[PDB]
mmCIF file of C-alpha atoms in Angstrom:
data_model
loop_
_atom_site.group_PDB
_atom_site.id
_atom_site.type_symbol
_atom_site.label_atom_id
_atom_site.label_comp_id
_atom_site.label_asym_id
_atom_site.label_seq_id
_atom_site.Cartn_x
_atom_site.Cartn_y
_atom_site.Cartn_z
ATOM 1 C CA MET A 1 22.299 1.871 9.355
ATOM 2 C CA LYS A 2 22.298 -1.524 7.622
ATOM 3 C CA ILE A 3 22.035 -4.744 9.624
ATOM 4 C CA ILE A 4 24.681 -7.433 9.257
ATOM 5 C CA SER A 5 23.253 -9.809 11.853
ATOM 6 C CA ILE A 6 21.261 -9.930 15.083
ATOM 7 C CA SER A 7 22.587 -11.990 17.947
ATOM 8 C CA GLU A 8 21.480 -12.822 21.492
ATOM 9 C CA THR A 9 22.976 -11.488 24.746
ATOM 10 C CA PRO A 10 23.594 -12.762 28.272
ATOM 11 C CA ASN A 11 20.460 -10.853 29.157
ATOM 12 C CA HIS A 12 17.635 -12.285 27.014
ATOM 13 C CA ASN A 13 15.548 -9.159 27.556
ATOM 14 C CA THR A 14 17.761 -7.334 25.104
ATOM 15 C CA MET A 15 19.121 -8.230 21.641
ATOM 16 C CA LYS A 16 22.378 -7.252 19.982
ATOM 17 C CA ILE A 17 22.188 -5.714 16.452
ATOM 18 C CA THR A 18 25.424 -5.697 14.472
ATOM 19 C CA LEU A 19 25.521 -2.889 11.898
ATOM 20 C CA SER A 20 27.665 -2.122 8.902
ATOM 21 C CA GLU A 21 26.633 1.541 8.860
ATOM 22 C CA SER A 22 26.173 3.115 12.251
ATOM 23 C CA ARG A 23 25.127 6.517 13.722
ATOM 24 C CA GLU A 24 26.693 9.646 12.315
ATOM 25 C CA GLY A 25 28.888 9.400 15.401
ATOM 26 C CA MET A 26 29.777 5.887 16.581
ATOM 27 C CA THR A 27 30.144 7.086 20.141
ATOM 28 C CA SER A 28 28.056 5.587 22.893
ATOM 29 C CA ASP A 29 24.610 6.894 23.816
ATOM 30 C CA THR A 30 21.275 5.953 25.460
ATOM 31 C CA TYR A 31 17.822 6.668 24.117
ATOM 32 C CA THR A 32 14.550 5.918 25.981
ATOM 33 C CA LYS A 33 12.155 8.496 24.599
ATOM 34 C CA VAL A 34 11.098 9.378 21.067
ATOM 35 C CA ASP A 35 12.523 12.727 19.822
ATOM 36 C CA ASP A 36 14.070 14.463 16.828
ATOM 37 C CA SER A 37 17.593 14.031 18.221
ATOM 38 C CA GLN A 38 17.402 10.282 17.590
ATOM 39 C CA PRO A 39 17.865 8.559 14.236
ATOM 40 C CA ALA A 40 14.603 7.965 12.359
ATOM 41 C CA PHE A 41 15.245 4.258 12.840
ATOM 42 C CA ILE A 42 15.632 4.663 16.617
ATOM 43 C CA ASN A 43 12.390 6.649 16.865
ATOM 44 C CA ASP A 44 10.434 3.998 14.907
ATOM 45 C CA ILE A 45 11.913 1.205 17.036
ATOM 46 C CA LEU A 46 10.964 3.086 20.226
ATOM 47 C CA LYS A 47 7.427 3.387 18.878
ATOM 48 C CA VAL A 48 7.307 -0.354 18.345
ATOM 49 C CA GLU A 49 5.152 -1.871 21.062
ATOM 50 C CA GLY A 50 7.250 -3.658 23.663
ATOM 51 C CA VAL A 51 10.493 -1.821 23.234
ATOM 52 C CA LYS A 52 11.650 -0.350 26.496
ATOM 53 C CA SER A 53 15.086 1.234 25.975
ATOM 54 C CA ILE A 54 17.808 1.465 23.358
ATOM 55 C CA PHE A 55 21.569 1.649 23.833
ATOM 56 C CA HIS A 56 23.942 2.636 21.030
ATOM 57 C CA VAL A 57 27.713 2.162 20.872
ATOM 58 C CA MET A 58 30.368 1.845 18.139
ATOM 59 C CA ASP A 59 28.654 -0.018 15.332
ATOM 60 C CA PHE A 60 26.033 -2.092 17.104
ATOM 61 C CA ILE A 61 22.781 -1.486 19.035
ATOM 62 C CA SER A 62 21.456 -3.121 22.206
ATOM 63 C CA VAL A 63 17.637 -3.181 22.137
ATOM 64 C CA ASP A 64 15.920 -3.963 25.395
ATOM 65 C CA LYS A 65 12.185 -4.708 25.712
ATOM 66 C CA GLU A 66 9.712 -5.182 28.547
ATOM 67 C CA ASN A 67 9.315 -8.526 30.296
ATOM 68 C CA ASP A 68 5.741 -8.885 28.999
ATOM 69 C CA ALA A 69 6.767 -8.096 25.406
ATOM 70 C CA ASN A 70 7.987 -10.955 23.235
ATOM 71 C CA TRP A 71 10.765 -10.921 20.623
ATOM 72 C CA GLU A 72 8.495 -12.954 18.298
ATOM 73 C CA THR A 73 6.551 -9.738 17.704
ATOM 74 C CA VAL A 74 9.101 -7.042 18.443
ATOM 75 C CA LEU A 75 12.320 -8.175 16.810
ATOM 76 C CA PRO A 76 10.942 -8.742 13.303
ATOM 77 C CA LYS A 77 9.694 -5.138 13.381
ATOM 78 C CA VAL A 78 13.023 -3.784 14.703
ATOM 79 C CA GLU A 79 14.909 -5.510 11.928
ATOM 80 C CA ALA A 80 12.400 -4.131 9.423
ATOM 81 C CA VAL A 81 13.134 -0.587 10.617
ATOM 82 C CA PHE A 82 16.732 -0.696 9.393
ATOM 83 C CA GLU A 83 15.595 -2.395 6.189
ATOM 84 C CA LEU A 84 13.177 0.483 5.488
ATOM 85 C CA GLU A 85 15.943 2.423 3.696
ATOM 86 C CA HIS A 86 18.455 -0.376 3.199
ATOM 87 C CA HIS A 87 15.990 -2.775 1.558
ATOM 88 C CA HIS A 88 17.475 -4.700 -1.326
ATOM 89 C CA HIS A 89 15.733 -6.589 -4.148
ATOM 90 C CA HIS A 90 15.969 -7.777 -7.750
ATOM 91 C CA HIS A 91 12.911 -6.489 -9.535
#
């Protein structure tokens, strides 16, 4: 799953992540707990402090965090997660 861009939503407690590559199946689903049935990315994101719940559909992900948590900390990490494998460079 490679990020194209991350946008805001009507509910500021969750962010919208637009992907080029999506889940094996681009059907809708909801993940709240860490487990093997989730994408590696989704597990990491869940483990990120502040992240409350994740919703997947089509080719974008809605990531919702707790009221106390701030996107200043969380979002950068979430973005990194997808980059972990899809990192690009010119070394």
